[PDB]
Design an enzyme around this catalytic site. Structure first.
Site, short mmCIF file in Angstrom:
data_model
loop_
_atom_site.label_atom_id
_atom_site.label_comp_id
_atom_site.label_asym_id
_atom_site.label_seq_id
_atom_site.Cartn_x
_atom_site.Cartn_y
_atom_site.Cartn_z
N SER A 64 40.87 23.78 16.17
CA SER A 64 40.52 22.77 17.18
C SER A 64 41.48 22.74 18.37
O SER A 64 41.14 22.14 19.39
CB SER A 64 40.46 21.39 16.53
OG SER A 64 39.55 21.36 15.44
N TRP A 104 42.91 21.76 12.13
CA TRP A 104 42.86 22.18 10.73
C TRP A 104 41.74 23.20 10.61
O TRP A 104 40.57 22.83 10.52
CB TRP A 104 42.66 20.99 9.81
CG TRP A 104 42.78 21.31 8.35
CD1 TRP A 104 42.76 22.55 7.76
CD2 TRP A 104 42.96 20.36 7.29
NE1 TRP A 104 42.89 22.42 6.40
CE2 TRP A 104 43.01 21.09 6.08
CE3 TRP A 104 43.06 18.97 7.24
CZ2 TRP A 104 43.18 20.47 4.85
CZ3 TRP A 104 43.22 18.35 6.02
CH2 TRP A 104 43.28 19.10 4.84
N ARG A 149 50.57 16.27 9.49
CA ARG A 149 50.91 17.12 10.63
C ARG A 149 51.54 16.29 11.75
O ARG A 149 52.64 16.62 12.23
CB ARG A 149 49.67 17.85 11.13
CG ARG A 149 49.35 19.08 10.29
CD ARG A 149 47.91 19.48 10.46
NE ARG A 149 47.04 18.35 10.17
CZ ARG A 149 45.83 18.19 10.69
NH1 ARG A 149 45.30 19.09 11.50
NH2 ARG A 149 45.14 17.09 10.38
N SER A 158 38.12 14.91 18.54
CA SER A 158 37.99 16.29 18.06
C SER A 158 36.58 16.62 17.58
O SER A 158 36.37 17.24 16.53
CB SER A 158 39.02 16.60 16.98
OG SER A 158 39.54 17.90 17.19
C1 LIG Z 1 39.84 21.31 14.04
O1 LIG Z 1 40.68 22.20 13.92
C2 LIG Z 1 39.12 20.80 12.81
C3 LIG Z 1 37.78 21.53 12.71
C4 LIG Z 1 36.55 20.75 12.24
O2 LIG Z 1 37.53 22.16 13.97
C5 LIG Z 1 39.17 19.27 12.85
C6 LIG Z 1 38.45 18.61 14.03
C7 LIG Z 1 38.86 18.59 11.49
C8 LIG Z 1 40.18 17.99 11.10
S1 LIG Z 1 40.43 17.09 9.71
C9 LIG Z 1 39.35 17.58 8.40
C10 LIG Z 1 38.03 16.82 8.41
N1 LIG Z 1 37.86 16.23 7.05
C11 LIG Z 1 38.69 17.09 6.18
C12 LIG Z 1 38.98 16.65 4.74
O3 LIG Z 1 40.13 16.51 4.36
N2 LIG Z 1 37.94 16.48 3.90
C13 LIG Z 1 37.92 17.12 2.59
C14 LIG Z 1 36.77 15.68 4.20
C15 LIG Z 1 39.94 17.28 7.03
C16 LIG Z 1 41.08 18.26 12.05
C17 LIG Z 1 42.46 17.83 12.12
O4 LIG Z 1 43.18 18.46 12.92
O5 LIG Z 1 42.85 16.87 11.42
N3 LIG Z 1 40.59 19.02 13.00
#
Ligand SMILES: *C(=O)[C@H]([C@@H](C)O)[C@@]1(C)CC(S[C@@H]2CN[C@H](C(=O)N(C)C)C2)=C(C(=O)O)N1
Length: 243
Positions: free
Chosen positions: A46, A186, A226, A93
């Protein structure tokens, strides 16, 4: 010194392989548990939204005021089932919005722009709305930190107003006159999973310290770690003291 020691001692409770890079326009500094991560290329995940927005605004594919309307299809996060400006989708995001922007840019223009600015390995493969999520685009933490440092200084090869608009999309908080800008990531589609927290602290005296946390993530990890770790590091460095 003792600040290095205090910084290191933070990472010595984090089990995950992590690196934290700082850049002040002259010196790269490296902290953390696996320093070679700083020279290793990972998908931007992201954090690519920074370059995506710049490329889109620079090439008249979006404006910072335009509303990206939800199309009615339930998205992964239910907080995404709404209309967004690019800045709003940046701070939430919202991947679908930035996928829609990438499709507006197109593979041909996206490729030449990535080559023009030298972002990571400049690879997009054949899916213009997935290359930062699944590869083949990769970037090292040192490349990221030098990228956002230039953003902060308006020295990227984009129009000044475009750089300013994307910069303020990243604004997180201020303490006194010091401003924190940041974007987390992430990447879950690749193995291992990579976690990002990149940004910069800008002080009133024009001075910038850019930073890039990069660490291994695993399913179930704390989503807030993070940012927490990064703010702790910046506090021990005296770059962004706690209030
Ligand atoms: C960006 O890097 C990432 C992807 C989708 O592009 C993004 C926007 C998601 C997250 S957090 C992620 C969503 N839910 C996850 C989880 O733990 N579960 C199992 C539902 C974590 C991020 C972030 O940087 O936190 N970016």
């Amino acid at each position: 010194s003792i600040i290095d020691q205090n910084v290191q001692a933070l990472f010595n409770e984090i089990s995950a392989d992590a690196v934290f890079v700082t850049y002040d326009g002259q010196n790269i500094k490296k902290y953390g548990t696996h320093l070679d991560r700083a020279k290793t290329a990972y998908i931007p995940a992201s954090t690519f939204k920074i370059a995506n927005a710049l490329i889109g605004l620079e090439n008249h594919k979006a404006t910072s005021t335009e509303i990206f309307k939800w199309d009615g299809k339930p998205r992964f996060f239910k907080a995404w089932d709404k209309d967004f400006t690019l800045g709003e989708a940046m701070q939430a995001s919202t991947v679908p919005v930035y996928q829609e922007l990438a499709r507006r840019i197109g593979p041909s223009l996206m490729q030449s722009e990535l080559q023009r600015i030298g972002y990571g390995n400049m690879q997009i493969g054949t899916e213009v709305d997935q290359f930062w999520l699944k590869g083949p685009l990769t970037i090292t933490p040192i490349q990221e930190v030098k990228f956002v440092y230039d953003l902060a200084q308006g020295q990227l090869p984009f129009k000044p107003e475009v750089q300013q608009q994307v910069k303020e999309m990243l604004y997180v908080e201020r303490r006194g006159e010091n401003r924190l800008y940041a974007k987390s990531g992430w990447g879950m589609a690749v193995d291992p999973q990579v976690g990002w927290y990149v940004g910069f602290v800008e002080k009133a005296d024009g001075q910038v310290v850019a930073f890039a946390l990069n660490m291994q993530m695993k399913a179930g990890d704390d989503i807030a770690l993070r940012k927490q770790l990064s703010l702790d590091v910046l506090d021990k460095l005296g770059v962004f003291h706690y209030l």
